[PDB]
Symmetry: C2
Subunit: 544 residues, 2 copies
């Protein structure tokens, strides 16, 4: 790693720049401490004038002398060191000005690039993108950040203590107040933005279903919150409300969503430093219902340090679709897909696009596809087209054509496809559903060609040996696969039988179904049937 | 170490007893969490009765059935587990009852024996007793204590959270409130009694003199105070007032002593865990003055943990004698001596004895003597007697006689000794003073016999060779040594010359003074002069 082993320096600079500011602070405080006993040694040999009243002749005239002379030297040191004391003080305040600037840099890079990114990594994991990865790498980052910021805090707080104990009419009250002004901005940043959802709630949940979330606070380790673990409170909130929550005009109470059976205590795992909070059993109650976005809000409150600073952290869950149904996991699961894929960075809670360029839908589709069917046999160059053709209802036969096209939400899952009484997503969903339902092996196995129309089925087979067939996703019927084969006295309606859905496949399996049919001789490319299915045929204590 | 490597177990028991109470706590909270979703599964299949209103014929009569049956079983589990939940709850409360009892034991041993003892070790160090030793061994103790008490704190605080979230009319509110009642008593103990003076202020100080103290808080390491270091405020207070401060009837403000130039911020040394506070430059202002005890009070305030508990620690300095003088370090230094030696454990601030049995004054005298003259040539059996005879003004010639005698303060430093116009302490003081002033080497060296009266001088020498002499502490004169020798035409007033004090020994040294006199031939026991002083004669670029 390069860009990471860059912040490991930006840190150890911060370490040493921080490690010398209290090296100044300390001696600059020896200064004060000494200067103060001089201020006083002065006052001492001064009220010594008011006490020369016990006065011999020559000698207590002539010690007015040694006294006045010891002042002339003192008041000189005292005046001379006053400006030493003011200067050093300024030096050190603009030294903080400096360490902070670099710290605001690190903070920014950590929080706005690193975390934002691990966050989207998660978001895309929603549509079965690659796993976020362990938070551990960022925590180290953040506690390292919290450690070095919180020092510099107690550092200028000692500086206060000094200046507020020996006033020095100067530019210092400002610099101090300005420097103390930015260090509080840098903490609220740190604290709030590090209160994050580790394990995200189920994106499509149904009323009364046990689900979980794990929220953690990365800084909780260092600046000391573990000391008495705060309660984090879950509360389900509408999209409309998440908008109101952000531009802080609430009535911090309402929650277009209503109660859910869990709201738990945080818990520190010593020797990981992870201040987790696992909600391992929550529950729900209370232009469509299927397009209704809700978000689970996680709020917690607590004080940092011995006490002074006290915060209320808030964090919104990725969006969620609540379904009181039989099941339309399917329609919701789209509005979720589209949200996870296309969310703009910092969109005001649930601002999704309305249209999207085909090749971006493509990588969403593909990602969810592979994740769902659990193969890395993705939607190949051709596959993407079969789709583009289906979705767009146009002939254009090679992909790069669509690069500039645009799909509305409504052309994805509002408008039903030309032939049919289902949407594009409906179709594509039913594909992933039957596939991951019965035919998972058969996919990376290669057995089900799938993304082909009656015509392509017709061409790819006509000149092939007798019994050559393929498996094709039936637009024919609501989520199935038709078997098209070819035997020689065929037709322009050449041999293909009517679709099998999940029903058929439960009552009896495809591999078996294929194995009973004699005309079906080998699976498209050339390879014989037994070969590609005999693994999956069902036996008994049976015969020849 | 045996009695110490006993608490290292009593600790690791506490560790494991504590380490399993949250093992119960945790599962006893899985229980609750589950039981709660059952309470709810019950309510679920209950409002299912109010919703059978969509009711076919036979089948929604005959599902009133499966419903009532699913309750009969639920309500049974629910009743049955409620008592499981109540019982475990009690088990764990009386399990804390248990860990705390053992912890109150450890605490007690640590604080009241160990610390009290290291404390007296220090107090006696006042009279030059052996050094306290490093606090480090006790801190480990105390943070180990603070660590294991503070867990058990967050532990029952989780128990609250549970019972205060699922009420259970029972014996538990008590046990919890009783158990929580003792754990707060055990902390105030811990916090307050571990705020201690590491380096004690100078026991006899004069107005406007730079002095220092170091106060530390042993728990500051673990339970988290370092997080923003508190200010500790020094304030000089009378004996009279220390009495009022204890039986809390102050007007927390007054201080029969008045200001002193210092009041500083605490400071954590990471990787020692020591939360020190060094006052490395304070300063004083404002039936005798020489018997006036004052104490330096150190007070500090702060909150432990995230915040909840907040304390004000107080700690009193060993007593102090303020002198606005030329110098009577001497009289003060006695009233300090007698205070450090004889202080009863837990005396209401400055309750000193009035009389004391000789042999205990003896070990005080001896201790200070060796410390002061910096030799481990102590007051020998005989020496102690020479004194006892001097102090008591009686003939009794061997020590064990005095074992039962008693010396009043007034017979120590009020009544002047029979012959003289000085007290007993005055004498003994001036002995240590000239000794550590000029003759430190000569003491362990053996050169000055010292604790002998004119008569003993007379006997020990009469039959010795011509020029045999000794050095004898002159009651003769205010803080000196007379040289008694013997030459053969002598007298019953046999050869001894008048005392030399500090004056004489400055203007010219004893060794030199002895080396000029020819009649002085060898130093008592037998050994020749040059032998025992030629080390210490003064040269020049001189001759034969």
């Amino acid at each position: 790693s390069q860009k990471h082993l860059q912040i490991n320096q930006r840190f150890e600079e911060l370490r040493l720049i921080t490690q010398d500011t209290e090296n100044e602070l300390k001696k600059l405080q020896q200064t004060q401490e000494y200067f103060i006993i001089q201020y006083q040694e002065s006052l001492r040999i001064q009220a010594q004038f008011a006490q020369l009243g016990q006065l011999n002749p020559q000698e207590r005239m002539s010690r007015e002398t040694a006294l006045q002379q010891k002042q002339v030297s003192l008041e000189t040191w005292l005046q001379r060191e006053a400006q030493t004391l003011q200067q050093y003080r300024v030096e050190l305040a603009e030294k903080h000005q400096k360490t902070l600037q670099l710290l605001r840099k690190q903070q920014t890079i950590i929080l706005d690039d690193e975390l934002i990114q691990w966050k989207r990594r998660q978001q895309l994991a929603g549509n079965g993108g690659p796993p976020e990865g362990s938070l551990d790498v960022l925590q180290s980052w953040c506690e390292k950040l919290a450690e070095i910021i919180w020092q510099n805090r107690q550092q200028i707080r000692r500086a206060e203590h000094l200046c507020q104990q020996l006033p020095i009419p100067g530019p210092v009250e400002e610099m101090l107040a300005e420097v103390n002004a930015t260090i509080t901005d840098i903490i609220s940043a740190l604290v709030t933005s590090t209160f994050i959802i580790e394990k995200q709630p189920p994106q499509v949940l149904k009323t009364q279903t046990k689900f979980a979330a794990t929220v953690r606070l990365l800084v909780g380790g260092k600046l000391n919150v573990h000391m008495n673990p705060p309660q984090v409170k879950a509360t389900i909130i509408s999209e409309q409300q998440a908008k109101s929550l952000l531009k802080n005009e609430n009535t911090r109470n309402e929650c277009s969503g209503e109660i859910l059976n869990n709201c738990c205590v945080m818990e520190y795992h010593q020797a990981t430093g992870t201040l987790s909070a696992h909600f391992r059993n929550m529950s729900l109650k209370r232009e469509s219902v299927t397009e209704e976005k809700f978000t689970v809000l996680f709020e917690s409150q607590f004080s940092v340090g011995s006490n002074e600073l006290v915060f209320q952290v808030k964090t919104l869950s990725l969006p969620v679709v609540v379904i009181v149904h039989g099941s339309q996991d399917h329609n919701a699961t789209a509005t979720v897909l589209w949200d996870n894929a296309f969310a703009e960075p910092g969109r005001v809670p649930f601002a999704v696009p309305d249209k999207v360029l085909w090749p971006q839908l493509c990588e969403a589709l593909n990602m969810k596809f592979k994740a769902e069917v659990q193969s890395n046999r993705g939607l190949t160059k051709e596959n993407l087209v079969f789709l583009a053709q289906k979705l767009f209802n146009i002939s254009s036969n090679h992909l790069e054509d669509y690069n500039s096209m645009s799909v509305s939400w409504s052309q994805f899952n509002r408008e039903n496809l030309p032939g049919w009484n289902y949407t594009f997503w409906q179709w594509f969903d039913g594909v992933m559903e039957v596939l991951k339902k019965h035919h998972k092996p058969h996919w990376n196995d290669g057995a089900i060609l799938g993304f082909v129309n009656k015509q392509q089925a017709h061409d790819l087979l006509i000149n092939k040996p007798d019994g050559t067939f393929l498996l094709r996703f039936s637009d024919s019927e609501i989520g199935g696969i038709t078997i098209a084969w070819k035997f020689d006295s065929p037709d322009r309606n050449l041999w293909n039988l009517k679709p099998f859905t999940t029903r058929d496949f439960s009552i009896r399996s495809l591999a078996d179904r294929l194995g009973d049919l004699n005309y079906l001789i080998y699976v498209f490319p050339d390879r014989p049937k037994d070969e590609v299915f005999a693994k999956y045929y069902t036996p008994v204590l049976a015969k020849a």
